[PDB]
Design an enzyme around this catalytic site. Structure first.
Site, PDB file in Angstrom:
ATOM      1  N   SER A 197      -2.765   6.963   5.043  1.00  0.00           N
ATOM      2  CA  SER A 197      -4.010   6.965   5.644  1.00  0.00           C
ATOM      3  C   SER A 197      -4.037   8.452   6.336  1.00  0.00           C
ATOM      4  O   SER A 197      -4.055   9.434   5.585  1.00  0.00           O
ATOM      5  CB  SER A 197      -3.946   5.789   6.706  1.00  0.00           C
ATOM      6  OG  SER A 197      -5.408   5.932   7.562  1.00  0.00           O
ATOM      7  N   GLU A 324      -8.205  -1.473  -0.201  1.00  0.00           N
ATOM      8  CA  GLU A 324      -8.245  -0.288   0.852  1.00  0.00           C
ATOM      9  C   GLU A 324      -9.483  -0.755   1.875  1.00  0.00           C
ATOM     10  O   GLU A 324      -9.292  -0.307   3.164  1.00  0.00           O
ATOM     11  CB  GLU A 324      -8.459   0.947   0.536  1.00  0.00           C
ATOM     12  CG  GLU A 324      -7.289   1.429  -0.576  1.00  0.00           C
ATOM     13  CD  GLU A 324      -6.052   2.031   0.084  1.00  0.00           C
ATOM     14  OE1 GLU A 324      -5.733   1.456   1.436  1.00  0.00           O
ATOM     15  OE2 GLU A 324      -5.357   2.911  -0.272  1.00  0.00           O
ATOM     16  N   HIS A 437      -4.995  -2.427   3.694  1.00  0.00           N
ATOM     17  CA  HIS A 437      -4.681  -1.061   3.786  1.00  0.00           C
ATOM     18  C   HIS A 437      -3.486  -1.057   4.624  1.00  0.00           C
ATOM     19  O   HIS A 437      -3.381  -1.694   5.711  1.00  0.00           O
ATOM     20  CB  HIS A 437      -5.861  -0.616   4.676  1.00  0.00           C
ATOM     21  CG  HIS A 437      -5.854   1.189   5.025  1.00  0.00           C
ATOM     22  ND1 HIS A 437      -5.785   1.986   4.074  1.00  0.00           N
ATOM     23  CD2 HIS A 437      -5.802   1.686   6.262  1.00  0.00           C
ATOM     24  CE1 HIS A 437      -5.745   3.247   4.698  1.00  0.00           C
ATOM     25  NE2 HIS A 437      -5.926   3.082   5.942  1.00  0.00           N
TER      26      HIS A 437
END
Lengths: 532, 532
Positions: A197, A324, A437
């Site tokens: 991320s 995601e 995610h």
């Protein structure tokens, strides 16, 4: 003594820790920069002054001052990401997991945590380097950096809050690994940095920034790339948010010195209490203080750097998760609930599209909707939900990463792409969220190997495969075993664009990861918004 | 005598003709307007002055002066559409096929031929009304109207070439059927007009025009609707083309009288020789002289008429062919050949998109390409060919007709939609063309019933089904037999939007005929082009 190491900054006393019924050394909380407190707030980090005696590195350090999620009190699913240590502005420390017996010159892996640049700790349970260090026999380093206003406030032109000081923090940690990891058994000429991320975006940023290029050998980027719409702002928007932040705390706004000084007198929790009020739009997947294209850390704009080959040419391994987006819709889009199937209506679908592409005019909002709507079944609640889920992921993670991998591969010396699409059997979040995610991380750090965590036998098998890929790649620049009989993770090329899936099923190679949408988000939409 | 009829214009002597081993009467070439020659060129039609004696209506009349296709000399596939009679400006006549014995008051069907408003004859073989008249026992009328410059030249404001005189021609024929069909056994209060392509657009135009509404009961539109991008122009573009036409023949352009007079002194073949030079863009599926929104025939703009319910409310039956576009790509887009599989490359694909949507900016051309390209297989020659084929059909026939059927159904008293997707076994055109534009006509007129034409047994079965649908609908306002055991052609409703396929297979009902693309062509693209 094996737990005693003498670095160029001073002596350090680590501790022995048990792992998978065996042991390794762990030097926790080694400092790499001077405490950024007082007049040092918002300012660039300074090298830690050497110390006499032995530094006690047997317990985790504090966590950077950050925003804490309280959307689901008690829920492990969201708290396993919150800071598990006292928060403090004195946060710049790093952790090292070294095999036993101590290696002479083994491969090094430096992990940079993610968190939207507004949160994150190196001390979370999911980031425990011992399993990976142990299983793959590598020195595992985990650094920390300042987040939120504390690490990204940016008043360009001023040396009091230049901006990107949070990235300088990371570079500092890397400089130390470069100058000292040899005394821990690591080989400084073979350090792989890997993130997730915001950390994946950070890794990609050291690849682009001239000042960091010489500090690592290879890189791994997970679910994040430097050119993501949320990872950076212009100096103008950075300045606009710096001021507005100061406006919420009633600060004198006549000059940068005026503002900065007022912000330095505020308690840490006061900046964090109003931090989210500065965003320019009602949005989802966007954060207040993030890196800014200043002309220093980043010479020019990112797109021109990617087009001119102005970046570190090496090997890289990157990929994304299947779903995601779901995580951000849950927290901010109307219609989604942690406890329901969250089927979305036409009204809420469009509210979501407005929240996901905040910078688009009415024409653009229509292009996105037309592109993600099956008009033969427009009122299907499950289709509008998964469609919204796709929009958020494609626009924020997948389509941006594919633009990077394609521009990079044209000048790189090897690219390996994956698509993680396996949902852990013990996930506590609802099913509609899917392959969430950041949940591929647990496989990278090998949590499946510890029985008590309740993973399936095939999940532990998947964890070892991935750990061997990441480790074999960190060491050789290729995730594959030289003369193995296993399936070969093909190389990604401008021509073929092959990639593999990462799950408990027999490896399958594919091509053009989500091309249809990636062309929309990278070529058409940008163009449309510019002409209108 | 059964072949002698006394109309309000004078007596007419028809002839007896054989059909499917039996016989019917046929009155061919009955006049309905004064010969539009000399000073009458470009002018509105005047009623035919009554005559004494018996008019000899036993042979076909002449064909309107028109452009003739010579792209494939000898090829039956293209010549069966060319005029099969002497061309002459004295073209306004109609043909009537009456059952034997003569009916007392049976259902009437008036056919309006298509041809892009620049060609067409009522005397072609495929338009022989005897099979249909005979098989369904209806009076079949076939009229003719002026095409090309001769019927659509438009210098608004002038009474010498007002425009739409070609549509007035059709209205004239309809006025005569209304005032005289009773003497042929027909029931004037039950006349169905039905057309194809430009004729389908003409039918839809009489539904919209106040002056024609009271002259028919029901309507059938095939592969064409009034709001098609090629069926009409503004008075400004009509005027622009009128002048340019005059500029190609070196005519004095100081005034409308100046121009018109010069154009009236030119031989018919001279206007036709330069007719195609006036089109504003390099295009495909666009014609020089077509109807124009003048404020008379059409009160206001078509879109506002369709939105305000300003049109004849009755029942309608309409549909389209599966592959409406192929025919125009063959003749004008680079890459297509009558003798090859015509696989199209990326370059020729995009050349085609430029030719198909001539009025679109670079942004629009990109929207169309993105919408019709499978990026996982972008260089597949068969996909680029069929994709181009779809663009031409969707934008020119299908998406426009679906906009009409939807706006209409909201105020109509019954709608029936079909999708003809059967390729005749004896078609002479290549396979890549598929279910070609205008080839459903042969089933409507029942050519499959005549053995010697070489149709399959199931094709003859399909021809009778369609003939019974059209005929049963013309009579009752519903294509279905009252208490039949056969499959019911469901009604089209704003809500369900059901429709049926028309082929040799067991009837299948569906919904939302090509919605995905119809939304793109009717809602998004229009909007995009307007904002940019």
């Amino acid at each position: 003594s094996e737990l005693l190491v003498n670095t160029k900054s001073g002596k350090v006393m680590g501790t022995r820790v048990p792992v998978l019924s065996s042991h390794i050394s762990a030097f926790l909380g080694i400092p790499f920069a001077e405490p950024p407190v007082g007049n040092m707030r918002f300012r660039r980090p300074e090298p830690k002054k050497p110390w006499s005696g032995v530094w006690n590195a047997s317990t985790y350090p504090n966590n950077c001052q950050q925003y804490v999620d309280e959307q689901f009190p008690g829920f492990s699913g969201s708290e396993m990401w919150n800071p598990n240590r006292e928060m403090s502005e004195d946060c710049l420390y790093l952790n090292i997991w070294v095999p036993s017996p101590r290696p002479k010159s083994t491969t090094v892996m430096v992990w940079i945590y993610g968190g939207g640049f507004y949160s994150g700790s190196s001390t979370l349970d999911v980031y425990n380097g011992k399993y990976l260090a142990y299983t793959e026999e590598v020195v595992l380093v985990s650094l920390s950096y300042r987040v939120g206003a504390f690490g990204f406030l940016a008043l360009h032109g001023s040396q009091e809050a230049p901006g990107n000081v949070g990235l300088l923090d990371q570079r500092m940690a890397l400089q130390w690994v470069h100058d000292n990891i040899q005394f821990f058994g690591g080989d400084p000429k073979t350090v792989t940095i890997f993130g997730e991320s915001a950390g994946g975006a950070s890794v990609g940023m050291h690849i682009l920034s001239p000042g960091s290029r010489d500090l690592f050998r290879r890189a791994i980027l997970q679910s994040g790339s430097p050119n993501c719409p949320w990872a950076s702002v212009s100096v103008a928007e950075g300045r606009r948010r710096a001021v507005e932040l100061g406006r919420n705390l009633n600060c004198n706004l006549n000059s940068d010195e005026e503002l900065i000084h007022c912000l330095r007198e505020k308690k840490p929790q006061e900046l964090i209490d109003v931090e989210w009020n500065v965003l320019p739009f009602d949005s989802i997947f966007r954060f207040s203080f993030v890196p800014v294209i200043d002309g220093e850390f980043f010479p020019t704009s990112l797109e021109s750097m990617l087009n001119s080959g102005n970046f570190k040419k090496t090997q890289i391994l990157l990929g994304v998760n299947k779903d995601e987006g779901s995580f951000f819709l849950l927290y901010g889009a109307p219609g989604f609930s942690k406890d329901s199937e969250s089927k979305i209506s036409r009204e809420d679908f469009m509210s979501g599209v407005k929240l996901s592409v905040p910078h688009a005019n009415d024409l653009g909002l229509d292009a996105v909707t037309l592109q993600y709507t099956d008009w033969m079944d427009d009122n299907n609640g499950i289709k509008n939900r998964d469609g919204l889920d796709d929009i958020v992921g494609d626009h924020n993670v997948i389509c941006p990463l594919m633009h990077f991998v394609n521009k990079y591969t044209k000048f790189g010396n090897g690219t390996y792409l994956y698509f993680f699409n396996h949902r852990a059997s013990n996930l506590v979040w609802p099913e509609w969220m899917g392959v969430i995610h950041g949940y591929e991380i647990e496989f990278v750090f090998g949590l499946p190997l510890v029985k008590e965590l309740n993973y399936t036998a095939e999940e532990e098998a998947l964890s070892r495969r991935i750990m061997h890929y990441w480790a074999t790649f960190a060491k050789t620049g290729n995730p594959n075993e030289p003369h193995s009989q296993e399936s070969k993770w093909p190389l990604f090329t401008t021509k073929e664009q092959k990639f593999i899936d990462l799950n408990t099923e027999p490896m399958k190679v594919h091509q053009r990861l989500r091309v249809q949408m990636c062309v929309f988000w990278n070529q058409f939409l940008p163009k449309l918004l510019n002409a209108t």
